[PDB]
């Protein structure tokens, strides 16, 4: 029934609130001027970056930023793994399939949720403590200065769909249970969970956005634009890995990127 699908939707929503401390609702409070705690410290050039590091050496700026992204990617994988484990039926899957789904899903989810922390002018960092302008990220020396630009461009169009947290929670579940990841051993029970999640998603969108026609369809088209961000991103990272003194890639991220599309 509709009701079983409502109940799945709510269950994913609560576990998303538990798993992810900075929700899209809070990011949007922060960014709009609403909320009544302090405005984020903004980082727009080298000097502001430096002063931001005492409010929020040895190495070059583009590399400091790179390595900061790694720290937050690592924690994001962790949060996403915990959310995955609350998706009904996920932990009954072959463990090797759980790993494959995370390995390919995590980046797609990361860039979906990054869009929550973004506007056309920059991005929240350190959990809403800071705001790092897009210009400044764009201004970094090659190849570092175009690392983020494709995330921003995706974010601006994705953000126009005006999804909320309750929507996003089912969307990210759907992405995680994609039956076409390379090397999956047993596709069937993954497509059966995903079938149920997609039905949950479609109900959710009709209920939550009754005025937004074909939002389900528009949102399916995004699950495959994400694919492109991911492949471009892996390509640019293979380049950095080749051309930069100390790759220094966190070993969680090395597990994820090894033998990846």
């Amino acid at each position: 029934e509709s009701a079983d699908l409502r109940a799945l939707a709510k269950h994913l929503y609560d576990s998303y609130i538990k798993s992810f401390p900075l929700t899209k609702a809070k990011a949007r409070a922060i960014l709009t001027g609403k909320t009544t705690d302090k405005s984020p410290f903004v980082i727009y050039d080298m000097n502001s970056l430096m002063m931001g590091e005492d409010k929020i050496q040895s190495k070059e700026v583009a590399i400091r930023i790179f390595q900061g992204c790694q720290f937050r990617s690592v924690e994001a994988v962790q949060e996403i793994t915990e959310y995955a484990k609350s998706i009904p039926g996920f932990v009954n899957l072959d463990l090797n399939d759980q790993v494959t789904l995370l390995k390919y899903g995590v980046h797609e989810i990361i860039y979906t949720m990054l869009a929550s922390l973004m506007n056309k002018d920059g991005v929240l960092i350190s959990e809403g403590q800071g705001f790092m302008t897009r210009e400044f990220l764009k201004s970094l020396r090659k190849p570092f200065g175009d690392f983020m630009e494709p995330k921003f461009e995706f974010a601006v169009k994705f953000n126009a769909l005006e999804l909320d947290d309750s929507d996003l929670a089912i969307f990210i579940a759907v992405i995680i249970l994609s039956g076409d990841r390379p090397g999956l051993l047993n596709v069937k029970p993954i497509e059966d969970i995903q079938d149920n999640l997609l039905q949950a998603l479609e109900l959710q969108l009709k209920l939550n956005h009754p005025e937004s026609s074909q939002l389900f369809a528009k949102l399916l088209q995004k699950m495959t634009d994400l694919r492109q961000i991911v492949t471009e991103h892996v390509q640019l990272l293979q380049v950095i890995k080749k051309t930069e003194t100390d790759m220094s890639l966190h070993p969680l991220l090395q597990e994820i990127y090894k033998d990846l599309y």
Binding site: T81, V99, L102, K103, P251, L252
Partner: peptide, 11 residues
């Protein structure tokens, strides 16, 4: 092999 991933999965 994916050692970290396996440990975060079973927990």
């Amino acid at each position: 092999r994916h050692k970290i991933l396996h440990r975060l999965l079973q927990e």
